Amino acid sequence: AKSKNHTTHNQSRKWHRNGIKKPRSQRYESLKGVDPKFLRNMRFAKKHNKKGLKKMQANNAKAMAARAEAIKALVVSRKLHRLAY
Amino acid sequence: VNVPKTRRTFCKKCGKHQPHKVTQYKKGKDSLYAQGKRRYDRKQSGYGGQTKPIFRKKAKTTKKIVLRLECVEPNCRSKRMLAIKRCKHFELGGDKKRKGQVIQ
């Protein structure tokens, strides 16, 4: 009264009837598993960005005119050729 | 193994490290009014006999060891437990070995 024990006979195909999925890749990957000292300082810098908008606003509202003044300162044979005309 | 009687370590209530007093731990007596005893006797009595199981196949021959760390500064007087790995032979605070003597 014995019995077979272990085998791997049909599993290199029994896997390929529905494909081998590359892992679903995607942008904006998560932030779970980072050290809290780095993530704290990034959180306070994500919390006090609305303190310095005006110098950022006028310094982006100057290159729109320097570009609009810079772009303003910048601005086979013969029988066959006839028959294809 | 062999442990010394006084270890200096953390204390929860005081905040700092403070010296302690080390002794080991023994169990308390089973009280009779506790809920699993007022249930076990109330269920045991009458006919029917034995209900809950009885352990018989004891295998291993050793206990884990638990220390009982008591504070020393007479205003705190707090205690907490502690756990050490398994051992058979055991003592506290006596006759620490040395280096290089005559072994018979």
């Binding site: 896997w15 999925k21 892992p23 050290d35 | -």
Partner: protein, 159 residues
């Protein structure tokens, strides 16, 4: 029924190469590792702290974390049919750069150099890599003499 230990079957793998034992040289450490770089993994038997499990020795991934003495890393693995995306924390000794991306970062620049130039020239310069074509017809000059006649050797028992 083999065992399931941490370091099964790594006699030759964590071993040091021949005549390269001894002290870890000091230009392994002071190289810089940003986030996003591509990294291959090679084990080492000297510094036992922070080894990878034996099934990563050769794989290659990218970084998501930097620590005080370690970087986190995202790799890929194949378990019974599917593919898992798993992340570890590896000390610096067991880690190198990969130079696979570099001939691409040398060909992005070479192409944009070959594009900024000669576009204003109205020239059409070839950009795609094209495989090795079949070779051209060419002459062979035998000035004077004739080809050397070969002869298959007659057998004799060498031994």
């Amino acid at each position: 029924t083999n065992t399931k230990g941490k370091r099964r079957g790594t006699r030759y793998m964590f071993s040091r190469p021949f005549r390269k034992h001894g002290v870890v040289p000091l230009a392994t450490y002071m190289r810089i590792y940003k986030k996003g770089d591509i990294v291959d993994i090679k084990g080492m038997g000297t510094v036992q702290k922070g080894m990878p499990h034996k099934c990563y020795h050769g794989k290659t991934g990218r970084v998501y974390n930097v620590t005080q003495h370690a970087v986190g890393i995202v790799v890929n693995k194949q378990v019974k049919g599917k593919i898992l995306a798993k992340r570890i924390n590896v000390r610096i000794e067991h880690i190198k750069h990969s130079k696979s991306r570099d001939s691409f970062l040398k060909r992005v620049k070479e192409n944009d150099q070959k594009k900024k130039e000669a576009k204003e020239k109205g020239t059409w310069v070839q950009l795609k890599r094209q495989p090795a074509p079949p070779r051209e017809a060419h002459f062979v000059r035998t000035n004077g003499k004739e080809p050397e006649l070969l002869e298959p050797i007659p057998y004799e028992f060498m031994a």
